[PDB]
Design a protein around this ligand. Structure first.
Ligand SMILES: [Mg+2]
Ligand SMILES: [Mg+2]
Ligand SMILES: [Mg+2]
Ligand SMILES: [Mg+2]
Ligand SMILES: [Mg+2]
Ligand SMILES: [Mg+2]
Ligand code: NA
Ligand code: NA
Ligand code: NA
Ligand code: NA
Ligand code: NA
Ligand code: NA
Lengths: 328, 333, 333, 328, 328, 333
C-alpha cells in the first residue's frame, strides 16, 4: 500500500460514490451463488420435518424431504450442501461406532443425493460429536480428556465410509492435531484419489454454536482442542499444518466474529479459503429481522463481508434466501 | 509469516490448549476497561428516561439522569462516553443550525459532564443528520444531493461549539471528503490545540444502523433514504485504506471503522498498514442482534465478551459499544 | 507467498478440478456486466451507420442511431459508454479548437445521452488527436514536437466543455505530463466537484491502435507518425508505476492501462502497488485480432470471455471493450 | 516501490522520451534471440511439407525438411526447438504406446537433429495426447476420466525414451499432478543426470489452443486437469510443487492472455521462467497482419511484453521472423 | 509502516497524551498476571529458608515452605512457576545422574505441587549444570569441551523423569544443538503427548547470570554453546530450528539487554514467545531501589517493556511483587 | 527471513561457536569508540568537583575542571560530549530566560570547549527543565499544563544561543510537538546551515531518569511531578515510529530513543523502518543500576561492554553513556 500523496480536494473519494454506474464499476467484491454452501440437518425417518427453537425458519429433514428440497437448491445454482445428521439417541455410544456405519444417516443421505443430483457437491461432516453419548468430540480418557490419536483412528474410518458413500468432500470439524494428514494418507491408500478434504483449520472455542447444538440434538466446553477466541497468530500455524498435511481447502469458524482471521489466512496462504457463518450468527440476524429491528438487507451485507475478507466459499444457513435474491 | 517447518506430531497445537495456565500464558489478546467507550442517548428536559424497543436494555436519558448514571460508569473505570442527542422535532431544519447552538442538548450535556466528572472523556458527535428534516448528514442541493463543502462549513461551526463546551474529543461521523482537515484547521486557528479528532474514517453505507436511527429519532426523517453517495460501499476494502490515509494526513488523532464485527477485516488492514490509534464502533444493530438472541435463550451471555475480544484481536485499540457497562461490570468481577 | 510445504500426493491440485461444483467454489475471479465499458464511434449528421472493415461487427453511428442502440446497452446493464467522435475533415486544424466546441459531436452526444438515459455513465475523451491536421495528441512547436503545457491549456478547455455538457467522467488519453492535475484544478475551480477523471495513466506507444485510428479517421492525418515522445515505451514496466503515482497525486479517480492483454503484467503491478480503481482498455487491435480469428473459424467464440476474464484475474476493476455488448448478452443468458 | 514524492513539473516523465538516445538508455527490457524457442510440427514422411489452415505460414515438415530448415534457424542464433510430432492415425491407441516407441517421430527427429546440429537445443513434448485415439491427455477410466498416476507411468517411459534419443530437455505438457517428480526420479535412476525438465507448470484450460489441434491432427474439454482461466493464486502452488519436484525451468501457458501469471511466477520464485505464445495467439496476430488490420511491428511488441512480464524464454511460432528482424 | 504524510501542527502527538482517559484508550500494551512466571530456588530440607547475598529479597525454600508460599502465588493468579533445585554437593557428579533421579529435588517438588495445586503450571529445568561437579553444562570430553549429543542423552532421561513427576512444561536451558527434537521424540515415544517444551532458544553467553549462580550454589565460560551477545540474525536460526524440532514455546535469555531479539523473534515467527528477566537484571533493579536511587515504579516499567517488545510470558523474580501491584 | 530448511545435525550452530577465531569472524556487531557520546554535568564557578551519590563514579565539574578532564576524553578518541548544566537555584524562573543567556553555563562551556578542542563534538541540551522553578520542560498555562508552542519560542532562542556559542549539534530533549521544525527553520534563517539537530524523537515518560534529576538538581523542583502529557507512554511502540517520521520530515540530522536498554525493541524498529542515523541514551538509572551491582560484587564489570554491545546489535549508531570513558579505556587496551 502506497497512499501516492492523494489529498483533498484533488482527491474526493465521493466522486466515485456519486452515481450508481461508477459505484458498480469500482465495486471491489460481490457475492454470487458460486460462493454458497448450504448446511442441512438430516433426520432418520421418512416424510418428516421438524422445526428448531433457536433456528427460526430452519428445518430438520428426513432424506425423502431432503431430495425434494434439493431440486430447488440445484435450480438456484447452489454448488454444495454440508450434511449434518441428527443421530437417534439409541445410536450414540462411547466408541462413536455409528460414525462409520455404512447405513448411518450421513452415508444414506450421501448415496441418495449422489444418485439423484450427480453434479451437486456433498460435503460430509468428519466428527465424533454426533455419535458420542456426551456430545463430546472424541474418545475420552479416564480424566474426561479427548484423546487425540485414538479419536483420529475413528475419524479415519468415518472419512473412508463417506468416500465409499460417494461424498466428493469430507470436512473434519473435530480439531484433533494431525487429523488432516491421517485422513489424507488413508484416502490415498484406499484409492480415494480425488476426495477433497475441507479442513476446519482455525475452529474457535465459541459460544456462537449454541443453536447448532439444539439442531443436532447434542445439547461441557472444548478449550482443550478448539482455539481460544483471543488468538490470531496461532490460526496461521493451524492452517500451515493442514495445508502441509494435504487439505484441498481450509476453513475459519465461526465467521463474522473472525473476519480478521479470514483476511490473514487468505493473505498469507493464497489457498482455497472457506468460512462458516454459524448457527448463532444466523439466529442473531434472523431474530433481529423477524423482530423488525433490522432490514432483510443485512443478510447480503453479512455475506458480502465474507467475500471482502477473502473467503472463496461460505457455509451459510441463508444460502437459499441469498440464492433467491441473486436469481431475482 | 514463517511456518518454520512445524509438523505433527512434533508440533501438537493442543499442548498449549491442555491446561488453563498455558492457555492464559499464550493468550494473544484481552479486553480491558481501558478499551471501552459507552455511546449514550441524551434527551432534552428533566427526569426523562425512555426505553428503546429495538435496543433492549438501552435507555434515552435527560441530562440530570445522565449525570446520575455516569457516577457508576466512572466507578467502573469506563474511560469515555460518546454523546448522541435526541433532537426535538421542531428543532430540525434545512440548515441544521441546531448543530452549533451553544444551548443544544449535546453542548449542554458536555458542559454538565465536564464539570461533574473532570476526568471522564467526552466524545461529541460532529454530524448534521440529527438536525436535518430529511435525515441526511448534510445540506442538500436542488437535486437532493448532500453538498460536500457547504456541509463542512456547518460541521466546522458545530465542532467549534463542542470544543467551546469543553469536549476533549470531537468525532465527525458525517463522511464528507476533507472534513477532518477543515475541522482541524478551525480548531488550530481558534486555539483548541488539544481537542482530539476521532475520525469516522471508513464508515460503510450499512443496514446495521437501523436501531440507532430509531433511538435518536432520525429514522422517521430519513424514511427510505440512503447514504450511498458518501458512506462507503460494503464491498470495498482497498478504498478504506485511502480513506484512513487522508484522515491521518488531515490531522486525525484517532481513526475509526464502522460498523464493527461485519468489518473486522477492515480493522485488521487499517491497524496493519497505519499503526495508528484505531477505533471501531460495535453498532446498534450488532448490539440488538446479540441482545435479541441472549433474551430468547438462543445464545449464552458469554457471546458479549467474545464479540468484544474479537475487536482486540483484529487490532482495535478502542471500541464504541452499548455493552460497555455490562462488560466493565464483568471485568470488575 | 507461503507454499506451506504442500507436496504430492498429499496435495493433488486436480481434486478441486474434479467436478464443476468444486471448480465453481474455488474460482478466484469472474467477469460481470458491472466491469464493462463500451467505447462507441459517433458520426455527425442523422441516420448514419458505417461499418469499419478493420473492426468487423463494429459500426460508426450518428447520434440519433446511438440513442436507439443505447436502449439495449442500458437494458443489458452496461454501466457506461466511452464516446469517440469521428471528426469531419474540415473541422481539423492546428489549434484543435473543435476540441472545446459546445456544438462538437462529443458535446452534442453527451447532452443527448445524459437527457435520454440519466443513469448511464458517459465517459468523454479528453484528447486533441481527433481535431489536429497532423493527428498528434497536442499542439506542435516549429520542430514538430508536441508541446506539453500549451496542449494542456487546450485539453483543460475541452474537459470543461465536457463537464458543462453533463459528462460524469472525463478521460484524458493524451499522455501529456501533469494534465491530470491541470484538469482537476480547472474542474474544482469551476464547481465541477464530482466530475470523475479517468486517467490514461500507463498508455503505451503501441501498434495495437491501428483499427481505432481507421475508425475515428485520424489514420490519414497521422500517416507514418509516431507518439514515442509521449506515449510510453512498450519495454518499460517500472516507469508505469511512476506514471500512476503522479496521476493519483494529481487527483485521478480511476487509473487506466492501455493497451490491455499485451500489458496484463502492468495491470497486475498497478493494482498490487496502489490498490486504487484500476481500468484497462481492450484496444481495437485486440478486438480485431480476436474477431478475425473467430470469423475464419480458427478460434471458438469462447475466447471472448477468456480474454475478458484475464483482465479481472490481472486486477482490473473495469474494462473498455468493443465486445461489451456480446459479453453482456452472454452473461444475461 | 517508493514514489519518492516525484511531482509535476519538477518531474516530467516525457523528458526521457524526448530523444531516441535517452529512450534507448532507460529502456528497461529487450528481446534477443537468446530468448527464443521455435515449436515445429514434424511429419512421418520424406520430402514432405503441409500447410495448416488455421496457422497461416506454418508448415508441417518431414525430418529431411526439418534438417534443411534448421540450418537457417542455427544461423539465426535460435537456441532451441520444441518438437511436436504429427502422429499417423494407425499409430494412435488407448494405451498411447507410441509415446515411448524408439522409432516414433519425436525420437527419430531428436536423434537426427542431435547428430546434425550438436549445439541446438531439442525440447521434446512429454504428453500422451499425440498418441491417444481420443486426443485425450492420458489413460481413461470407465467414466472417461484421465487417470493421474497410471498416465504418469506412460509419460515416464516416454521421457526416458526421449533422454535415450539424446534430447537435452523434456517438457511435460500433460498437467498430471506430481509428474515432474516422477519423471525426475526416473531420469536420475537411469543416469540421465543432466536432462533438463521444462515443466508446463501453470497450463490453463484454454480456447487459444484450437489451431495447434489442427496442426497435430488431434482435432472434449480439459478442465479436470488444466487450470481454470480465472485462477492466479493457484498458479503459485503449481509452480512451487514443480520446483520442489525438480524442474529446471517452469512455464506458463498460454502466453499474452496470462502475462500477469508470468509476472507473479518470476517475482515469487526467481527461477528460470518460460512462456508459450500459443497457436491461437500466433494465428490472431498473423490473421490481422495479413488482413492489413495491424502492422508487422505488433510481433515484436507481443514478444517484448513477455520479457517485460518476466519471462526468460518464449516458445513462439514467430521465432524465425523475430530472429530475422533482430539480425537486421 | 506508512507515515501517511502526518505533519505538525495538524498532527500533534501530545493531543492523545493530554488526559489520562485518552492515554488509557490508545495505550498499546499492558502487563497482566497472565504474563507472569515465577522462578523459585528449591532446597533439599524441611522447615528451611536461606537468603542469597546477590539477590536481595529472594529466598531459597525447602519444599514444605514452597507449598506455603505457593498458596499466595495461586491467590494472586500467577500461572506458573519455574523450579530451580539447589543440589546438595554430595549429589553432584561427572555423569550428572542426579538429573534423572526420581527422588531429586526437582522431581519431589513437582509431585508435591502437582498434587496440592493441580491448576498451577510447573516448568522444570532441563539442564545438567545443577548436577555436574564443575557446574559446567554437560558431559566433558578430555579437552574440557561440553559434548553435544552425549549430554542430550542425559537431558532426555531427565526430561522423561520430569514428565513422569507430572510437570506440564519442561524447559531445556542447556543450549546443546538439536536437544529440543531429541526431547520431543522421547516424550512422544513414551506417550507424554501433552508435555510442553519451552525451549531456551536464543540463550546468550551473558555476565547477567552471576546472582543465579550464587542462588543455586554452582558458583569458566560458556561461549562454545551459549550465544555471542553480538549476534541477532543468528537468533532467528536458533528459533527456526527449535520450532521445527517441536517446541511449543520459545524463549530469549537474558531479557531487557535483548529486547531487540524478543521483537525480531515475535515478528518473524508469530509463535508463543517467552523472555527471562534474569537474576542480574533483578539484582540491578532491586539494588538501585533499595539504595533509593530509583523508584519502585521501574519494576512495572521493565515488565511493560517485555510486553511491548512482543513477549507473551516473562520469567521474573519480581512476579509476586508485580502481581500484588496488579491486584491493587 | 528465510530459514532455508536448516536442520540438525547437518546444521549445528555450535560449530561456529567452537573456537575464538570462528566466533570473531561471524561476530555480527562490535562497539568502538566512534559510537560513544559522554554526557557531562557542568557546574558554575571555578575549581568545583562534586560527587553524585545516585551515580557512583560520576562527578559534576566546573568549566576549568571540565577542560582538564576533556584532555583525556579527546586522547581516548571519544567523538563528542553532551553538556548538561547544573543551574544555580536563583537562576530558575517561570519564563526559563536563563535558557538563552549568552553567559549561561552551557553557553560558556561550549565556547571554552570549542576553542580548546576544535575537533571535539559538542552537543548542547535544548530544554527548559533546568531553568524552570517547577522542573517541567516548558512554560505552564494557568492549569499547570506545559504549553506547546509558547515553550518552542523559548527553545528556539536557546538553540540559537547554542549555535552562536559554536555548538555543532543541538539536541532538543523537550518532547514538544513540532519543535524540531521550528528549531531547524530558525537555524536556517539565521545562517546556521550546518548546525546538526539531534532529536530526542521517542523519549519515554520514564522512571529511569531519577539519578540525572538529582545530578542537575531539577529533582527538588519537579517534586512528585510527571511529564505524561509530553514524554511518551512506556507501553507504546507504534507511536514511536510516528514521532521519528515527523522529526525526519522536520529536518533532524539524527534521531534518538530514550531511555535505552528498556527500549531496545524501539531502537530496532526505528533503525529498521527509517534507515537514518540512530542514537540511544543509556540513561542515568541504567548507569546507576549497573554501577550499584558491580560495586556490591553482584555483577562482573564485563556487563558494561555487554550493555553497550546490545545497543549496537539493536541498531544504534551512537550511544549517550556515562560509561563512555570506562568503555573507551577498555577498547584502547
Ligand atoms: Mg489443527
Ligand atoms: Mg474521508
Ligand atoms: Mg503522466
Ligand atoms: Mg502440477
Ligand atoms: Mg539451539
Ligand atoms: Mg515529536
Ligand atoms: Na467462490
Ligand atoms: Na485500548
Ligand atoms: Na468492476
Ligand atoms: Na532469456
Ligand atoms: Na501473555
Ligand atoms: Na557509530
Amino acid at each position: 500500500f502506497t497512499p501516492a500523496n492523494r489529498a483533498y480536494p484533488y482527491t474526493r473519494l465521493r466522486r466515485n460514490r456519486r452515481d450508481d454506474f461508477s459505484r458498480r464499476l469500482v465495486r471491489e467484491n460481490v457475492l454470487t451463488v458460486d460462493d454458497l454452501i448450504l448446511p442441512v440437518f438430516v433426520l432418520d425417518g421418512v416424510n418428516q420435518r421438524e422445526s428448531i427453537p433457536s433456528m427460526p425458519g430452519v428445518e430438520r429433514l428426513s432424506i425423502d424431504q431432503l431430495l425434494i428440497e434439493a431440486e430447488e437448491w440445484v435450480a438456484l445454482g447452489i454448488p454444495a450442501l454440508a450434511l449434518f445428521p441428527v443421530t437417534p439417541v439409541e445410536k450414540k455410544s462411547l466408541d462413536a461406532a455409528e460414525a462409520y456405519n455404512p447405513e448411518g444417516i450421513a452415508q444414506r443421505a450421501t448415496r441418495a443425493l449422489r444418485e439423484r443430483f450427480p453434479e451437486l457437491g456433498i460435503i460430509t461432516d468428519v466428527a465424533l460429536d454426533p455419535f458420542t453419548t456426551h456430545g463430546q468430540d472424541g474418545i475420552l480418557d479416564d480424566d474426561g480428556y479427548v484423546l487425540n490419536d485414538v479419536s483420529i483412528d475413528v475419524l479415519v474410518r468415518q472419512a473412508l465410509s463417506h468416500a465409499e458413500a460417494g461424498a466428493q468432500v469430507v470436512a473434519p470439524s473435530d480439531m484433533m492435531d494431525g487429523r488432516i494428514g491421517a485422513i489424507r494418507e488413508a484416502l490415498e491408500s484406499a484409492g480415494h484419489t480425488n476426495v477433497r478434504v475441507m479442513a476446519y483449520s482455525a475452529k474457535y472455542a465459541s459460544a456462537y454454536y449454541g443453536p447448532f447444538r439444539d439442531a443436532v440434538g447434542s445439547a461441557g466446553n472444548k478449550a482443550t482442542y478448539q482455539m481460544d477466541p483471543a488468538n490470531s497468530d496461532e490460526a496461521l500455524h493451524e492452517v500451515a499444518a493442514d495445508l502441509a498435511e494435504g487439505a484441498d481447502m481450509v476453513m475459519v469458524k465461526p465467521g463474522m466474529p473472525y473476519l480478521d482471521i479470514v483476511r490473514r489466512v487468505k493473505d498469507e496462504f493464497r489457498a482455497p479459503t472457506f468460512v462458516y457463518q454459524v448457527s448463532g450468527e444466523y439466529a442473531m440476524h434472523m431474530g433481529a429481522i423477524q423482530n423488525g429491528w433490522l432490514a432483510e438487507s443485512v443478510i447480503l451485507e453479512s455475506l458480502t463481508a465474507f467475500k471482502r475478507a477473502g473467503a472463496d466459499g461460505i457455509l451459510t444457513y441463508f444460502a437459499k434466501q441469498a440464492a433467491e435474491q441473486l436469481r431475482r
